[model samples]
Target: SRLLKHYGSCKTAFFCCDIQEKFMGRIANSANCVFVANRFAGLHTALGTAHSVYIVTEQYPKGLGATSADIRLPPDAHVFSKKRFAMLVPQVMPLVDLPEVEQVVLWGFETHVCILQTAAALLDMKKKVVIAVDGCGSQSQGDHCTAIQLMQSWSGDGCYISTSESILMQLLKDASDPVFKTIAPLMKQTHPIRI
Candidate 1:
């Protein structure tokens, strides 16, 4: 038998992991991560807050500052501050624990560290994780690329490495969707960088 998981709006959550100020110049293509994060956050709005969960984490915000100013997390987003590399900290677990959340869409800084650790934690909890490649970056291309490949190997185990456009389209699912008009234009914007 084949394993299949559907990405319904209500069952999806967007995790913006530590895309903070301290990481901007340090992480290669961090600007692109911001761009993709902004776009995805916009799509989350188009989908409507009631239909999806939006979570943002600031890795020790006191030191990292805060999520980059360019990134516009949803007003209703659950923002957490943590010293941990994984975003699945105690405070945010309750929301992920919700019966409606089955899949988490992640994007942000230090691809090999925070993103990798968070994805592993999510998988251990039997939650499906989607990594938006363009929305992730590391200090070096080697680290970033290898981490993506490692996660890709777990595709059969519910780890998905995908582009921002594909994830947005899947959420819309149809041209006739009322929010399509709003989301359509966002998709037309050029991806900031190539993976």
Candidate 2:
């Protein structure tokens, strides 16, 4: 849904907070977009598939668990150790080395904390960040809403809050694309009914 709505494959990247297999499954299922796993097995699976990858941890292999074997990453995937909520500062060198990225897709846990801080940092870097509301989860609904509000407030020039379908439509500008053409019928299938 996130891919179909807010960011329809415009050189996007996924940022995962932890090394949860379920999260990785989702990312794998939603292939084509790049991924940057924060720690552990996250970076492993993302290495080969991701256009650019980064592994950030509070400490070296001690603080955050080492990358698992299941993941197949490129030898050049950037790796760093940081002691802050926003991993951008210490790990910025790798992100900077990547080709000019158009947009970033942020997904992970603790929306109020890590996700929020990272989104802010991306904004600071002047990158268009689209937070997938569904892909991200928080401790509480209130935390989620608050995080969204914070992102919305901070979003100025190159940031947006959107849904997967909306972003997909923007990317698939033409109705000729098979996916678009298939959905096109539904667009005209609706009838206006007033009581």
Candidate 3:
């Protein structure tokens, strides 16, 4: 099997899944997730529609509340409310299904559940997925760390487990890219994110 690596502005989509109000206080490293979400949004904003796509999903918002006010999603981000653990509900497929979207950058809540399910679903479709480790978390550290490890085992196939800072820089691919200068400052603060 051929392995897929590298991220291009045109081929990558950012998925902010179920990072909602209700899960905040309980989830471990939630603040780190929020910071990563904002960083991803900032990148999307700079790239704009011609270069990238950003998708935000809220699971059962009627009970969970909306995407946190803290996450500044791109104005054109494809936002959807879903009852499914995986963000790939029918409403989100058209965007993910786009032929241009070969790599998906994932970040959000409950790593063991929603994030894990979403990653699995994306991988099943032969898509390369990058999990921003500090950008997602679980209520329990064990669940969060274990889930990350389990997903990392698939790295040889198409799964990449990495930090938000590393992923963002890698996406830029060059300090010369005009957007890099604008986004570089976001990496200034070190997140005390575990796992």
Best by TM-score: 1
Cα lDDT for residue 99, candidate 1: 68
Worst window of 10 by summed lDDT in candidate 3: 1-10
State TM-scores per candidate. 0.92, 0.54, 0.92
| Candidate 3, 1-195: lDDT as tens digits | 132233453477899989999999889678889888888888878766776789999988999989889877778888998888998999889887877788889989989999999999998987889899889889998999899999999887788798787788777767897787888877775665644
Estimate every model's Cα lDDT from 0 to 1. Answer: 0.84, 0.48, 0.84
Per-residue lDDT tens digits of candidate 2, residues 1-195? Answer: 222222234344545443333333433221211121222123223323433333332323464444333444445555454556665664554554354555665655456776788777877776677765544555466877887887877555566665433443554567665456544433342222210
Q: Alpha carbon lDDT of residue 52, candidate 1?
A: 75
RMSD of each: 2.1, 9.7, 2.2
> Using TM-score as the measure, what is the rank order of every candidate, best first?
1, 3, 2
Model 1 lDDT tens row, 1-195: 012133453577899999999989898799889988889788888777566778999988888898899887778889999989999999999989776787889988888999999999999888888899999999899999999999999888888898888888767777887888998999888866765
Candidate 3 regions with alpha-carbon error over 4 angstroms: 1-9, 189-195
The alpha-carbon lDDT assigned to residue 161 of candidate 3 equals 90
Model 2, which residues run further than 4 Å from truth?
1-10, 19-82, 96-99, 175-195
